[PDB]
Symmetry: C3
Subunit: 318 residues, 3 copies
């Protein structure tokens, strides 16, 4: 929402009665991708259901689901069984923040959000490890204390069943329970400096052989926005990752224009090097069109890995 | 909707404010199929979500999703992951019609609608190629100007990633992008002769090695409906297709009765020859029952025993 | 679902006009399972849609869908295509009860509901064969006539297409239609004894080489509840199954406390032996938390005998 143009918007209230509400939201987002003059339909629908029940003025319960649905006809009127259950959680919140269990966001998304401002492109050099991103078996916390926003998460290792040598098997055939070692945590903080338009952010995450930190800053004036983000860590034992993003935005009437630069290195070789620009027209707050171009600055990476991309989108938010 | 009894009904408005509306629709449709005395559960649920944002009095935006959900227990309380994302589109519309991108109908369904009036059977001799039917990677247009309805669609070929010999592979193993050559288009027009009861329609489509035209006409007056449909084309290199449908319908009170004859030939051999009849009772606009029988006129001189079998269907349909 | 805590609650009316209504229901149910100190995310969402069209005072139609959605990331932000279409039916009801076709409950769940009162655990020694449980290609009936509740179902065998030697093949290759022999039926009765707080229940089912009956009784009085359930039958040719279950419940304010003993024997070997206890707190009718512990008394693999702690938070849509 807002400057994070690709993010979900709040849904429509379909039931409300007695501090209890049901909001149905999501989107129908038509997306045409053009690479080497060849089209791919990257359209997606999301459907989401957010229930909130006020328990008292200090406390509320929440439930949330979101699914994403796509097609891949390849030229036939095919049956398309493409579903991703993006979110499945319940939680409790109040004046001291909100805590959930189930698949939900970890702490670093609101840091990557400093530079993730484009309708389609961008966010290519800010890889989030699972516990920092969105993942199940996870306790997720968010709170806002004046000008300070904090998020945190803690993921449990997933239970599995193993034989007497440690091979993973069906429970019926197992000798004992073990786990996959995929416990982890994430933490972030954002400080908004009053009404100045200046925000800073930082965070960290760790999960088995993966770890990272992030630093960001942004400055918002009346119709202009600037931001930078830095990520550094390991994606595996002896696989370094470092990424940098810059973002700029300008708003003119109902239109928003953005540009980003994204550069990442994986194992000390460049893995992303993108300059992208876009334009997004808001007819209404829930109906928009956009056009975006990614200059892919990798070159002879493979031919396919170095191709530029044009994207054209029409987005309706439920 | 309406005379196209198997089609969706408009949904229920659940939200309407600030120039935005949300309609939730779909169906829960219980369907027992009996062939050679043997029962198959053909029940299906649809759920759909239609969003409309009024921009000004001659402009609006739309978003639409429809999913179909079924079971196939085969005698066990099974876990059933059966989903078909039937429609996923967004569009912009207004005085000059509506255009969408994403999986949506092409132009010929409104032509097949002339004879596709039964609750379960019919529509067996009017095959639509993908771009004419419903398919993704497609821009789809529809407009109604007085008594003239027009539709058009254009589908792009799908990009793929290939190796040095053109075999489709993952993007990491690929030498280059290519495409599948599945571009195409469709077009149609329907003229409704105001209150006379007469309608005429035609259309055309073309996609890769397939093409077809359709012609149709109908008469509706005072609870009676008659129609005919002709389709002719090619479904592949060296595979002609010609189909004929006739339809008649009668509405009495809350009941609707229909009959269709459908005859198709594929590569100059009869591939469908069906006479079907049905009765549908509308308890309420969104709750109905029906019974239907298809007399399959194919026989052992032209088709296998299974391909030649008749079908009884019994349904109960609730529309959300 | 009242005392049957793990069951669905009625949904929220999003549309209502002229005796036609649409309810959107379901849950978002966060569930952490801990065994031998190791955690599993058993969280689930349900989404459901119930349409009802009053036709007259004594007649209505219904349509229902429910899906269940889960994740299994295993430590990655995975794409999760996990969907179970639990219910897909339409029906007609009124004075003489309600009849449906499409995937819906058979007759025995209202009997297992005598002791299936826990938030998470319980219902481990009351196996229901498909026709008695929930399955498609089935006609389902329910009706209440004063203090007598009845349910019944009949399942057709599923048609298939076979070659000339009986092997299942695709229709285009087939010689004839056949079926898989999965026809079956179920029946059950519950009698409420007037104003006494006592109910008794019985039912039975049969489907191919599986059959069973169940007997149950319950007492409900003044924030307390007790019940028993017995199940006996066959899960396959020469494969016996016997189960029993005891349950107790106590309600104090917004809190409900339950305990169950469940013991089942499959082919004359103990296959479930569980004592569970829990506590559920209803903050609001549609938001609850719970905690539950299952003492697994089997000691036969180490894994098969492990206890479980569950913690839940449940939002009902
Ligand atoms: C990043 C750390 C931000 C610290 C903010 C300090 C604000 O102090 C204001 C003093 O009162 C006015
Ligand atoms: C209310 C005035 C806030 C401005 C703070 C600017 C912070 C720059 O130093 C960042 C470290
Ligand atoms: C609309 C129904 C018209 C029926 C024509 C039937 C042609 C051959 O059918 C066999 C009876
Ligand atoms: C007016 O009288 C009734 C007309 O007949 C229509 C009956 O159609 C439905 C038959 O299937 C019923 C399944 O419950
Ligand atoms: C909506 C579907 C309702 C189905 C009604 C069931 C009556 C069908 O009985 C068929 C018996 O088949 C014998 C072989
Ligand atoms: C409070 C009475 C408990 C009775 C438990 C009986 C256990 C029998 O197990 C048979 C082996």
């Amino acid at each position: 929402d807002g400057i994070n143009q690709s993010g979900d918007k709040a849904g429509s209230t379909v039931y409300s009665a007695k501090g209890t509400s049901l909001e149905v939201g999501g989107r129908a987002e038509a997306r045409l991708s053009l690479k080497d003059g060849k089209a791919q339909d990257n359209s997606r629908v999301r459907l989401n259901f957010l229930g909130k029940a006020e328990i008292n003025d200090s406390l509320y319960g929440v439930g949330f689901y979101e699914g994403e649905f796509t097609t891949n006809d390849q030229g036939k009127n095919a049956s398309n069984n493409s579903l991703d259950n993006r979110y499945t959680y319940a939680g409790i919140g109040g004046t001291y923040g909100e805590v959930t269990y189930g698949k939900n966001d970890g702490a670093l998304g609101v840091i990557t959000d400093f530079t993730d401002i484009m309708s389609y492109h961008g966010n290519t050099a800010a890889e989030k490890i699972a516990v920092a991103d969105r993942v199940d078996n996870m306790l997720a916390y968010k709170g806002q204390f004046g000008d300070l926003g904090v998020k945190a998460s803690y993921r449990f290792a997933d239970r599995n069943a193993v034989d007497a040598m440690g091979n993973v098997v069906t429970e019926t055939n197992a000798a004992k329970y073990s786990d996959n070692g995929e416990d982890g945590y994430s933490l972030s903080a954002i400080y908004t400096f009053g009404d100045t338009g200046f925000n800073v952010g930082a965070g960290y995450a760790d999960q088995d052989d993966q770890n990272e930190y992030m630093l960001a800053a942004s400055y918002r004036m009346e119709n202009l926005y600037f931001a930078g983000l830095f990520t550094d860590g390991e994606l595996a034992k002896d696989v370094d990752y470092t990424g940098y993003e810059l973002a700029a935005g300008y708003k003119l009437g109902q239109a928003a224009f953005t540009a980003t630069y994204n550069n990442a290195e994986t194992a000390k070789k460049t893995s992303a090097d993108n300059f992208a620009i876009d334009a997004t027209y808001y007819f209404k707050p829930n109906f928009r069109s956009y056009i975006s171009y990614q200059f892919n600055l990798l070159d002879s990476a493979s031919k396919v890995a170095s191709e530029d991309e044009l994207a054209i989108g029409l987005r309706y938010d439920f």
